[model samples]
Target chain A: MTEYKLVVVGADGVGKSALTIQLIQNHFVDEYDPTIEDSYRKQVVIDGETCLLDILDTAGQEEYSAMRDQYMRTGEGFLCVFAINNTKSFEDIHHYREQIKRVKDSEDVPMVLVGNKCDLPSRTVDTKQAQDLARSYGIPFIETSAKTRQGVDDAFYTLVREIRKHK
Target chain B: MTEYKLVVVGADGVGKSALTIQLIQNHFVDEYDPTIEDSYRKQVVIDGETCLLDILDTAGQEEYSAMRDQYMRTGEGFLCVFAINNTKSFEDIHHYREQIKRVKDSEDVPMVLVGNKCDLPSRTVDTKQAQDLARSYGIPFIETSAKTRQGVDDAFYTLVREIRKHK
Candidate 1:
């Protein structure tokens, strides 16, 4: 089975829980309860084999890397979240994806760089730019509108394959 | 909803039908039959909306592509296939990926590089090396065992993500 344990991380209000809900419940959430160890299971196939992914909606589980150290054990993947209007949330990606490398003590950690709020008419970052950056890091990247439920499932799915591959 | 039309392209006996069968039925074919116009469906949620995908299984024979270009219209994604034991099966990938780009008229035409015959102990190519090549092309790559079913489901799941990302 190409299963994995994953987390959703980004700056506050970047729609971490919103995105997770889209993937888990097949819909969007405008607002949500943030402090739950919520998880969802979806039956999927990887490499033609039946697989199960147990997802933990670790939205604020460790919001700040500086705030926690005990939870840094490896073998987890991430849907590294950010906002499209917030250009800085993305540079935060280099830091977060880099964090995944350091915590796991390796450069090839699994992650998918996600820019949320793609549905908003106005945004600061160009979609291509985020993708190019993700390319340089050898990670898959996408833009999603948690409000409209776009690409939410893929963000979760991409990271699983990233972890399942090369490991 | 975004719907994708996909095709399998590779040299004969590279496990095009076997890989497709494994992806659709979760069972590998020690042998195959391609006379049927077999297509499978999946629901994909991404980017703020739901999408549908239809995958058609076809052989990679030269006669197949040369037979007609009308079927080569835009909106086609590819599963580039190669046999692990037959090194040349992969050399044909570059041609097919590029061929789709030209016919599909999009630099963003998505594809997944598939390395089949993983259950066999012997190999004619370096598995890790293929991944590096796949990375260079910004494509998701995997080695799948149609027989023992190592990474088979992911082989199909990975491509839709590739097609949906960076768009």
Candidate 2:
């Protein structure tokens, strides 16, 4: 049985926990704890392979350098997230992208750039902008609305694809 | 005559524009455009050295890779900003930090970690958390209230100091 370690990172309010919950529990959490570090496991099949996904949802409000570096070093794949409605969140997307690369000590690490909160109609970040960034990084980009459970599965499963390709 | 090209970056609404405006105009902007790439110049003396500060307040809402890459290449120093109230914004500090290092192709690039919007009482990110992160990066960190004009000058001036030291 192979296990994939995936970490979800983004600006605090981008609903990363929600996305993870949506993937794991198949539901939406209206309000979540910002300071909890929870690791979730899900058994799923990707590309005809049964695997366990050990997903880590970090504390968006808590800054722990040791914890971050530790996970970044161990995680096989990453999902760098941002909110489409918050332009600032979108701008900070590169932060996690670059950090993960440095910690992993490889630019070829399996990763995906995620644009969360796609259910909101009032968007400050354009879809084209996120697409351009992902293109530049040579990584897959996804738009997800955890509230509506839209694209939640694709975002995680795509990372599995990236990991498979990387391996 | 030396010119310091400083770029301010953070998640949207963390007051990157407001911090720059507060520094240059000595006032606060209650409302600002999110999609404007504005360059501001100010002739000031930092530690008795008179120089032009070519400060670029990038479009917080705009995600132009060419523009970001162009500025990141030429900028002498950077201010990686986040809001104290927004834990998510604080988490994204390393995104710009690591990206600038990669763009500049050096770990010793001059930069500062800034926590803005100190005027708000409901703070989600702690001072110690930011301090720890900055310490890990070996960079200076400052808390600022762009609305109240507190620590605004220190934030920019510290970057100037870092630039001078790097040069």
Candidate 3:
């Protein structure tokens, strides 16, 4: 069985855990603790191939950057999430990507840029900007709604494809 | 000026800082260092009412949970972000919410459950699950993509509305 480690990186409250649970357990757990200890392993399947998705769900506070960077190094795939409704989240992708590259030290590693929260149309960050960003990073990009399950599989599958291509 | 302190919380790399920067600065700063100590306070006028938004962006690592809790005390509102592509981030929200309630001692505070990364359809957490979770917790929910600017403004505006309504 080929195991793929997927690191979910995002600011606090961007639904990293939800996406993980949804991917592995196919459910959702509400009322999460952002300040809890690390629980770093999950499994999933893509393209009929069973793969272990070792997830490192880091805390979203500013003080944990050093520790978060440590986990970024171990993952082969990165699912960088930002709220589409929050432009700042999108803007921070460059920084997050830089940190990931710093730790992984490989520009060739596969990464997916995720714009989360598609359920609400009124609070949009910017569509053109996000697409441009993905283009600039040369990574797959998608807008997803975790609440609606919209683009859920596409985001993960795209990353899987990217990883496979790199492999 | 009615000052509202808003804290952005989620798993690391969910783009809380990006969202904050976009909301305040009207543009994205591509190369933001998540490890740096960054905090800013700004005022925004909505509906002819000026409100001071004291934005606190936290680190996204689990080790700094203790340090992250310190800022919870001052938050009048919360924009809890999670990667729509990762279920673990959603699962952790329960603990994060609990910590917030525990530290703030305010159950009635305005909160918005944000499912970020809506731009990517392949990588989604689960739409119904996130909505159900939000309903169970009694908070408004939305799926947003910070990269595309989708639902970004609405997410924050909704929370701001909630805050105003409560105030």
Candidate 4:
């Protein structure tokens, strides 16, 4: 079976770990240790192909910047996550993209922009703005809510498809 | 008068130091300490406006990677240099660009790609390839020979112009 290495990254409290756990365990965790760096492996079928996805849930704290290059170098694809209600988190997405590109040394790395926490009715980042940003980056945009599992599977599946398409 | 904070960066032995010195001192040094990190200020008139350019010539050695984020954080524009005869240096240019973008936290930063040592007849990176790469980055590319001062002024002047345009 093929294995896909995916990395989830964004600013602090953007729900990177929540999204990853939601994908692997099918559960929503509202509170988690703030300084978590965890990994999970799941066997899933996407587009009629069985595969193993190795997902890395990275720390979102600013202090974790020292640890990012190591993870970014090994990741094959990235899920750039941002909380829908947090505008600063949305602004920080580009830095993660730049860091990944710097470590991977490729301009066209596979990535999916994930707008997390869509369950919240209030949003500081509008859907249209996020879509426009993704369009500018030439990457697919997905709205996800790990709380309700909305678009969760689609996000990871789309990221896998993007990795395959990149290769 | 406005001051432009410009950074010169690339792989080792790509003539970044020579290019900066050529613009500031109108002379070239064939050899120098490999661990040099120098800064020079020059007052020049571009398009009938006098300005001060604070050019930071960064050390290109691999060990200097730890020091790059600090410089990249402050530079307003960048001069990404690579030797015309060294293919590896050309490949390393993207890493510098990514690092700059990561630190500056901007996608549309002003920059100019300088293909140095163009005075040499033998070359590994073609002029067309460099131009194409610049086009892909949406930045201007200039060929320069620090030893002969070919395109030296144009490279720095164009970078200043790019900074003004970006503002």
Candidate number achieving the greatest lDDT relative to the actual structure: 4
Model 2, span B1-167: residue lDDT tens: 88888888777788987898678656667764463355555678989988788887765543543467888998999998899999888877777787888899999999999889898999999899899999999999999999999889999999999999887
Q: Is the docking of candidate 3 incorrect, acceptable, medium or high quality?
A: incorrect
Every model: iRMSD: 15.8, 19.3, 13.3, 21.1
Off by over 4 Å in 4: B1-167
The candidate 1 chain A region of ten consecutive residues with least summed lDDT is A31-40
Model 4: how far residue A135 lies from native, Å: 1.0
**How many pairs collide in each candidate, listed in order?**
15, 4, 121, 0
Residue A85's lDDT in candidate 3: 76
- Candidate rank order under TM-score: 4, 2, 3, 1
TM-score of only chain B in every candidate structure: 0.82, 0.95, 0.89, 0.97
Candidate 2 per-residue lDDT over residues A59-87, each given as its tens digit: 56645544688888888998888999999
Mark the regions of model 2 whose C-alpha exceeds 4 Å error after superposition. B1-167
What TM-score is obtained by chain A of candidate 2? 0.95
Residue A43 in model 4: lDDT: 70
Candidate 3 lDDT, tens digit per residue, A4-60?
666778877777766654554355456554532233343456778886555555556
Ranking by lDDT: 4, 2, 3, 1
Predicted complex 4: DockQ: 0.01
Please list the Cα RMSD from the true structure of every candidate, rounded to 1 decimal place: 20.8, 17.1, 16.3, 19.2
Q: What proportion of the true contacts does each candidate reproduce? A: 0.00, 0.00, 0.00, 0.00
Off by over 4 Å in 3: A1-167, B28-32
Between candidates 1 and 2, which one is better according to TM-score? 2
lDDT of 4: 0.87
